[PDB]
Structure 1
């Protein structure tokens, strides 16, 4: 059934599962034509497929050439997502294939279900959580590899860097979603917080700075403060 606050710890048990987020698959800019009409131009996008227990991220880059000569692109994007997720499962050895795939947007259920008909024992689930994975393109190294791509490309990352050496999956996922929530609510401030101190660098093979444990506490508190402030502003509370 649907994933919600009640059954939240199931994310960190030992049944393999993947989140799939399609928000950044079909990305456009909107502009004016010479004659004054509106047109779109696609830019490269990505499927965000994440194992929340291990941090393994399967970033499938969606090159603008996919769309060439196609109609109803926002609908096509959901089917291309499901095609690529299915191909990913097929490419994994049996013992690495997920037992569940949780889609962050309910419109992906039918396309993934149809593409996964060969895997009847893989459960396709929606979620009631309002996960912030659209902000994935606020992470500088993910945005960089998506925008440079010249062809379809799968790039693998651990979205938790090395955190799991010191914290549990539950805590790691809570840190990730806090960071992404903040980047979503106010990217400029969130990014200021993360980089303010030049003495804290990002390892070449990491996505986030190499904070000590104490420094992660200050960071996390600063991200909480940002999120609550923006909320009072949105609603005038």
Structure 2
């Protein structure tokens, strides 16, 4: 987020500071809905940080006042922007892993959003029609 970067990159004399990522969300949404929204937004910013920057401004007004960090947006539009953000994360995962986004299961999407997924090397062996042979 460019506020954090503009602060830290041009700061000296190390000092503690306090923020709040639930800008005005707690007035209308719960705590672990705010956390899930934050996780989605942060995963997106980890994915692109520029496409999600455009998604975070669905209009050109997009009043992100200096009083807080996230744009002042309504819950009904929050649902739509969350859908677009989820689509972005899935599209990037599919692009990088050559998978099909429609083929992902529910728990697959949950694991994609939360953390990461385990691979499978060739050294991992599952050693755990009939052709008769005379010997």
Q: What TM-score, normalized to structure 1? A: 0.41
The Cα of 1:195 is off from its aligned counterpart by 2.2
Q: Decide which structure has the larger Cα Rg and report it.
A: 2
Query: Secondary structure, in 3 states, of the residue corresponding to 1:171?
Result: helix
In 1, Cα distance between equivalents of 2:82 and 2:91: 14
Is structure 2 residue 78 aligned with structure 1 residue 220? no
Q: Distance in 2 between matches of 1:185 and 1:145?
A: 22
Partner of 1:164: 26
Query: How far apart, in 1, do the equivalents of 2:73 and 2:34 lie?
Result: 14
Say if 2:33 is the partner of 1:210: no
Q: Runs of 5+ in structure 1 lacking a partner?
A: 1-138
Instruction: Say if 2:6 is the partner of 1:144.
Output: yes
Q: Which has the higher helix share?
A: 2
Q: Which runs of 4+ in 1 moved over 6 A?
A: none
RMSD, aligned CA: 1.0
Aligned pairs (5 A) from 1:121-140: 139-140=1-2
Number of aligned residue pairs: give it. 99
**1:196, distance to aligned residue in structure 2 (A):** 4.2
Q: Which runs of 5+ in 2 are unaligned?
A: 100-135
SS at match of 1:187: coil
More strand by share: 1
Measured after TM superposition, the shift of residue 199 of structure 1 is 1.7
